């Protein structure tokens, strides 16, 4: 008997080149009012929430130094249909291009985001990335998005 | 009232990540380096580890950290949260540092066992105190 709204969704590994969130695969959940609509989490009541997510990027070799990975969680209000970033990070996994002389070493970069925010009833929350081509869901527990009311 | 636990690395232990015993209250126990959940319900689970290395010997270096669950019903290990990191950019002596932090909310069953593990305990860093840890909190 936990009456607090809460949610934990995971990437659909069958979706190719897309960050698609899924509910209730084993070890995922939507509880006490929280809903997944249009790939967003919909908040059922006004209040303070911890919001979090992780993504994992993987690349085979580094052909340009200028690769840029981003991950951001944003919020849209029912009152204003306008998007505001709550948490965002940026990462550049490459410091030197592969000297072709060398050959195809994989790199891995995780980004975890989390924090506490006042949200309003009906707010919609998105966790998005710039490069779904570089996403890695070869395994469970690598990519997820959740919230917990305080 | 609500079960909770926060364990920390034993810095004495060489070549494994050993969580320190008896911190952990209200039914939660540490058995066989795992946290044992005393009641079914929703839990926040979390952990952090810190890796430290001298120079980049070869870019082949991979760090992993993962939290898994074994259901008393399932008796099979399932990953809940997991991350991978490769620190050795522009690899061959400059020291490097890499943290990995994991956390999220899960429905667990009474008797479930939770593990927080890594692949390279040789690269663990205990120089920053209280910063390698593993915990849970019932909601």
């Amino acid at each position: 008997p936990s009456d607090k709204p809460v949610a934990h969704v995971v990437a659909n590994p069958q979706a190719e080149g897309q960050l698609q969130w899924l509910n209730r695969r084993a070890n995922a959940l939507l509880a006490n009012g929280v809903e997944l609509r249009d790939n967003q989490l919909v908040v059922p009541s006004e209040g303070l929430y911890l919001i979090y997510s992780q993504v994992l990027f993987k690349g085979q070799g580094c052909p340009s130094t200028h690769v840029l990975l981003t991950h951001t969680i944003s919020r849209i209000a029912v009152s204003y249909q306008t998007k505001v970033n709550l948490l965002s990070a940026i990462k550049s996994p490459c410091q030197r291009e592969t000297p072709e002389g060398a050959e195809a070493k994989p790199w891995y970069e995780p980004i975890y985001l989390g924090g506490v925010f006042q949200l309003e009833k009906g707010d919609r929350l998105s966790a998005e990335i710039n490069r779904p081509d570089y996403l890695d869901f070869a395994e469970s527990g690598q990519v997820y998005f959740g919230i917990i009311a305080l | 009232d609500k079960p909770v636990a926060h364990v920390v690395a034993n810095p004495q232990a060489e070549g494994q990540l050993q969580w320190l015993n008896r911190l952990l209250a209200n039914g939660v126990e540490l058995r066989d380096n795992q946290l044992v959940v005393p009641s079914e319900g929703l839990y926040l689970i979390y952990s952090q580890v810190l890796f430290k290395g001298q120079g980049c010997p070869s870019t082949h270096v991979l760090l992993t950290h993962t939290i898994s669950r074994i259901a008393v019903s399932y008796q099979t290990k399932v990953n809940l949260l997991s991350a991978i990191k490769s620190p050795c950019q522009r690899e061959t002596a400059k020291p490097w540092y890499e943290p990995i932090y994991l956390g999220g909310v899960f429905q667990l069953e009474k008797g479930d066992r939770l593990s927080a593990e890594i692949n390279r305990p040789d690269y663990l860093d205990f120089a920053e105190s209280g910063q390698v840890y593993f915990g849970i909190i019932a909601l």
């Binding site: 911890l50 | 926060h6 926040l44």
Partner: peptide
């Protein structure tokens, strides 16, 4: 001992 982290708000 107990440094700041993203979840601490839920444990007091």
């Amino acid at each position: 001992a107990c440094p700041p982290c993203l979840w601490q708000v839920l444990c007091g």
